[PDB]
């Protein structure tokens, strides 16, 4: 009976809620009363990467912490040397509509995609010297919200069809399709172990999928609106969700509940890109009001403001060594902060 | 200097990339991008032939102007978080079929198709991202409209009607009703022009609308208004 199944689902939800309530005694805010505050962090724009002629929608750091891949609506991915503002090579995209990019951990492949429902993966290290399109993965019935390289042969890509997929490069097919999100999946972040990854979507839900198995281990729903960005804690046992409710939330994998929110009255706009510092004590989140706010992690306090962007900030990243913050925005200017 | 020979060559390659980027951007600035929208019956595909999966792009040159039509009807997802991807389109082409005044939706037949088109037009025209983006409204399928109008009055679609059932008066009424949903009347302009299946002149109206919008954008950038 459908009514019986709905009753069983409601009972399961009530049991999960009771378990979550029982597992919590004192919030992360209470436990961190005696922790020394981070203090105001004064950060300046060391480098400004001009050259894009349209709104920038995504930007990803390489492993080497010097190379930066930036995708813009002008239809050209640009690879920048961050130390000295140099364009390594520019890739003319087939579809001018791009909403994601990725730099492989090896550094040989660069992925992109967008409203073309196509995951275009290009090979940089080529004998011919140009940058050809190695693969054009197809099979998503919606916009490509995010794409991340697990390794040189597999890529995790989330689409607006309420699905995510683990594509193999050589075969070009979806090895494992992760479905279960009610709304359109809008961002994904891989754990450092490259075994679990959490995808946040339209349904105010972040689901932690296991790559090897292919099922949603846990689902965390604490927001009230769209989830636009997500980023793992450096440990891998927690992550951060940025929503249109103007509040980031820190979700712990093992506790399976919201550890602490990041809300302040004067900011009502949404959150587009959320990143973490190398130590994890800092949460840089790119808000919808032409700004990026650096919050404390152990406390819900404003550690700093990265003001200086003219327009909406869409991409936000942190180097592996944590020496810089790229906070590219819609005014076609990547900005390196330190 | 304080740079290596390899470093200097890298800077020069960056300069060449910059020159190519500037050339491509100058080519694209002269170019015009249009966003084509449809609701319900979505007869725009038909009129697609008159000026000529995810985003469908059609490039066509008219009077030395390079138009880039974008059709998005196959996206079928949350519009509100990809609509902002077309901020800065020169104009939006909204194709509404007059035959929809009586034809009802496939699902929930209690709702009229023309009213659904009106709701979508309200959503797009009055959207925050498209405050400065103009709208070109083709009231297409006028032939079938003329064929069918003398069967039932527009009361079936719009009860608040006090006009005759001729093609011209009904066309004026539907044009005015569609235009009434533009809340920000001063910020954007609606260029309305009725079309049919067999029309070889709609490209001319598109061209006139885009040249008007381009001049308006240039005037605003220069600060005249």
């Amino acid at each position: 009976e459908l009514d019986q199944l709905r009753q069983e689902a409601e009972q399961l939800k009530n049991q999960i809620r009771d378990a979550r309530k029982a597992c919590a005694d004192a919030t992360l805010s209470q436990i961190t009363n005696n922790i020394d505050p981070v203090g105001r962090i004064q950060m300046r724009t060391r480098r400004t990467l001009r050259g894009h002629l349209a709104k920038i929608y995504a930007m990803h750091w390489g492993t080497d912490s010097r190379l930066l891949v930036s995708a813009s609506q002008d239809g050209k991915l640009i690879i920048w040397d961050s130390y000295t503002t140099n364009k390594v090579h520019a890739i003319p995209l087939r579809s001018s509509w791009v909403m994601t990019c990725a730099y492989a951990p090896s550094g040989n492949y660069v992925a992109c995609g967008g409203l073309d429902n196509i995951c275009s993966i290009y090979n940089l290290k080529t004998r011919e010297g140009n940058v050809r399109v190695s693969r054009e993965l197809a099979g998503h019935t919606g916009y490509l919200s995010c794409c991340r390289f697990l390794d040189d042969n597999q890529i995790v890509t989330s689409s607006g069809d309420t699905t995510c997929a683990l594509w193999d490069i050589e075969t070009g097919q979806q090895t494992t399709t992760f479905t279960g999100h009610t709304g359109d999946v809008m961002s994904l972040s891989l754990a450092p172990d490259t075994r679990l990854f959490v995808s946040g979507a339209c349904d105010a839900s972040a689901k932690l999928w296991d790559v090897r198995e292919g099922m949603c281990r846990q689902t965390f729903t604490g927001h009230e609106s769209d989830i636009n960005a997500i980023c793992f804690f450096p440990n891998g046992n927690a992550f951060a969700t940025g929503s249109d409710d103007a509040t980031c939330r820190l979700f712990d994998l093992r506790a399976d509940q919201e550890l602490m929110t990041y809300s302040h009255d004067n900011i009502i706009c949404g959150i587009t890109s959320v990143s973490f510092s190398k130590s994890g004590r800092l949460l840089l989140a790119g808000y919808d009001d032409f700004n990026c706010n650096v919050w404390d992690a152990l406390k819900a306090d404003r550690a700093g403001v990265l003001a200086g962007h003219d327009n909406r900030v869409s991409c936000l990243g942190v180097t592996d060594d944590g020496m810089a913050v790229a906070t590219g925005s819609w005014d076609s200017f990547l900005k390196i902060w330190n | 200097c304080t740079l290596s020979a390899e470093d200097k060559a890298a800077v020069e390659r960056s300069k060449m990339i910059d020159r190519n980027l500037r050339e491509d951007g100058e080519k694209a600035a002269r170019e015009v991008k249009l966003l084509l929208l449809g609701a319900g019956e979505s007869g725009k595909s038909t009129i697609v032939k008159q000026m000529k999966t995810g985003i469908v792009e059609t490039h066509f040159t008219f009077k030395d102007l390079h138009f880039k039509m974008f059709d998005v009807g196959a996206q079928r997802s949350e519009r509100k978080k990809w609509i902002h991807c077309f901020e800065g389109v020169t104009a939006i082409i909204f194709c509404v079929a007059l035959s929809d005044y009586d034809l009802v939706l496939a699902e929930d037949e209690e709702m009229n198709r023309m009213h659904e088109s009106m709701k979508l037009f309200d959503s797009i025209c009055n959207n925050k991202w498209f405050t400065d983006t103009s709208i070109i409204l083709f009231l297409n399928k006028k032939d079938l409209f003329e064929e069918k109008i003398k069967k039932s009055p527009l009361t079936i679609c719009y009860p608040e009607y006090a006009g005759s059932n001729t093609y011209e008066e009904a066309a004026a009424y539907i044009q005015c009703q569609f235009e009434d949903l533009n809340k920000r009347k001063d910020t954007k302009e609606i260029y309305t022009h009725f079309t049919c299946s067999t029309d070889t002149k709609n490209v001319q109206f598109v061209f006139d609308a885009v040249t008007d919008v381009i001049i308006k954008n240039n005037l605003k950038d220069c600060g005249l208004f």
């Epitope: - | 390899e6 470093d7 020069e12």
Partner: single-chain antibody, 232 residues
Framework: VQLVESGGGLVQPGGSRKLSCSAS????????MHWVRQAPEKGLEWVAY????????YYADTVKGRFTISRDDPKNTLFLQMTSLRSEDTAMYYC??????????????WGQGTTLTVSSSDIVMTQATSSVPVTPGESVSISCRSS???????????LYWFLQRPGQSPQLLIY???NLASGVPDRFSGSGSGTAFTLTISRLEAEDVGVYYC?????????FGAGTKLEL
């Protein structure tokens, strides 16, 4: 990828010729081109270089004024116009592709080369050995001292090791003293301290035979070395 050259042969002295290196198999517009020389029984010597877009045209001291190096990008060809020949230019000329960005591999591919015969403050690197008998499967070291410190302030060493097999065109082995060019076995390795550098070969094979040359890349004079010859 091929860079076959055309033009040369026996030339009356003091005249004029042209060497045309045909570019095919790769995007020649985005690559700088180096013309390098090879005396009949002597080592290498940099001659000329034109960058992408022909905006950077440098020459060696010996070939200033007399030489000219140009590129037809739409035609995918490299031209070397030669005026006022002397007896010192009797040699084999190679056209070399070099792309220049972060993590690039300059001098990646070398053309076969064309032979020419006429009738009758630069870093001087040395490979004092210049000859070392070897046995297969043996780890060997090959040194190339530098006059000035190739360790630039940017943090990149600028020593290149190439290998030329007998009767062939030189092929890149190591770039920037640590990085390995694509298509080179992992046995080859490089080390240095900014002034003294050395290759290390874990195991020697038939392919490893030939002559190894060291290149500086700080100042554009780009002096090679005498090179070390491997003999079984």
């Amino acid at each position: 990828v091929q860079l076959v050259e055309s033009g040369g042969g026996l030339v009356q002295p003091g005249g004029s010729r042209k060497l045309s290196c045909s570019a095919s198999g790769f995007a020649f517009s985005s690559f700088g081109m180096h013309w390098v020389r090879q005396a009949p029984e002597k080592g290498l010597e940099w001659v000329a270089y034109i960058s992408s877009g022909s905006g950077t045209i440098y020459y060696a001291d010996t070939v200033k004024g007399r030489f000219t190096i140009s590129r037809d990008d739409p035609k995918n060809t490299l031209f070397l116009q030669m005026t006022s020949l002397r007896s010192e230019d009797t040699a084999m000329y190679y056209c070399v592709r070099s792309i220049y960005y972060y993590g690039s591999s300059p001098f990646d591919f070398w053309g076969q080369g064309t032979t020419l015969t006429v009738s009758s403050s630069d870093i001087v690197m040395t490979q004092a050995t210049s000859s070392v008998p070897v046995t297969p499967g043996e780890s060997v070291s090959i040194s190339c001292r530098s006059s000035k410190s190739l360790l630039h302030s940017n943090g990149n060493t600028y020593l290149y090791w190439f290998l030329q097999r007998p009767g062939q065109s030189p092929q890149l082995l190591i770039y920037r003293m640590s990085n390995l060019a694509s298509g080179v076995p992992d046995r080859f390795s490089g080390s240095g301290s900014g002034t003294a550098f050395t290759l290390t070969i874990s195991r020697l094979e038939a392919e490893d035979v030939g002559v190894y040359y060291c290149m500086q890349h700080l100042e554009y004079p780009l002096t090679f070395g005498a090179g070390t010859k491997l003999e079984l």
